[PDB]
Design an enzyme around this catalytic site. Structure first.
Site: not given
Ligand SMILES: [Mn+2]
Ligand SMILES: [Mn+2]
Length: 283
Positions: A84, A107, A109, A111, A124, A210, A212, A255
């Site tokens: 990322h 995402d 997360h 980040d 990232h 992302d 994830d 990712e």
């Molecule tokens: Mn990310």
């Molecule tokens: Mn993520």
């Protein structure tokens, strides 16, 4: 809109081997031919070569240049890349072209870290804090301007691994974030509709997705999976609703790591989501 694909085989923003192959793992899975079959004239500008800090810097500097030129010819950059951290270069290339760029951060997360608050220093996990713009100077001041975006123009969708200093900044900064709780509570439809209205005051909107953000059962090939994520169907719904709104002016899919994937299941899903983002309809 003429789709310009820009590969960014970047793995230096993270410690896990293989995410630099994301671009090839998405190209395989037939990204180009699927987009051509949909009516788009798509140009594949290839991959940006990479050789921590400086190589992250130089690579993103080159990414920002291509994204900037793509938008200059008003084509729509579709990045797709590795970790990322490439969003630093991507947003550096698009923000200057929009007086009020919006960002949908898909995402698990936030980040929103910094090398001091980072327990790993993996960049990232910083691209959104950078760009906002809080972080290492050479990173924040990429392409000679900062910040690229305003916290009030960011909508994170999918958060579920956000603990500690990130949360504090969210509430102090006024970002709108839909965690798994809000998605479960309101349903994805309402989340997107509230996202669209919220971002209705933007000249353009960048989608930073992302993989994830999706549950690991649907997107296992990621370096930092987090259980209880967005479903394959919910994700397609969001892409379809984003297309119908016509707000998305740039996008990056990051990712994808084939070394952690199951028969390119995650790379395939990435292509499938791009299709829905760019207007593929079941009917
Ligand atoms: Mn990310
Ligand atoms: Mn993520």
């Amino acid at each position: 809109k003429t789709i310009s694909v820009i590969g960014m085989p970047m793995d230096l923003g993270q410690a896990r081997r293989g995410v630099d192959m994301g671009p090839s793992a998405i190209r395989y899975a037939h990204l180009i031919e699927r987009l051509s079959d949909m009516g788009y004239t798509v140009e594949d500008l290839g991959d940006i070569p990479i050789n921590n800090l400086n190589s992250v810097l130089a690579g993103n500097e080159k990414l920002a240049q291509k994204v900037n030129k793509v938008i200059e010819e008003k084509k729509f950059p579709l990045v797709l890349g590795g970790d990322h951290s490439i969003a630093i270069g991507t947003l550096a290339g698009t923000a200057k072209h929009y007086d009020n760029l919006g960002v949908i951060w898909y995402d698990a997360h936030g980040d929103l870290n910094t090398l001091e608050t980072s327990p790993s220093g993996n960049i990232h996990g910083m691209p959104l804090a950078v760009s906002l713009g809080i972080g290492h100077e050479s990173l924040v001041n990429l392409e000679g301007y900062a910040p690229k975006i305003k916290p009030e123009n960011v909508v994170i969708i999918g958060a579920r691994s956000l603990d500690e200093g990130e949360r504090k900044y969210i509430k102090e900064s006024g970002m709108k974030v839909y965690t798994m709780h809000e998605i479960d509570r309101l349903g994805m439809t309402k989340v997107i509709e509230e996202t669209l209205d919220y971002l209705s005051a933007c000249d353009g909107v960048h989608l930073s997705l992302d993989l994830d953000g999706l549950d690991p059962n649907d997107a296992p090939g990621v370096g930092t999976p987090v259980v209880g994520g967005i479903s394959y169907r919910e994700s397609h719904l969001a892409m379809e609703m984003l297309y119908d709104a016509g707000i998305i002016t740039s996008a990056e899919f990051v990712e994808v790591n084939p070394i952690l994937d199951h028969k390119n299941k995650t790379g395939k899903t990435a292509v499938e989501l791009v299709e829905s983002l760019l207007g593929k309809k079941l009917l």
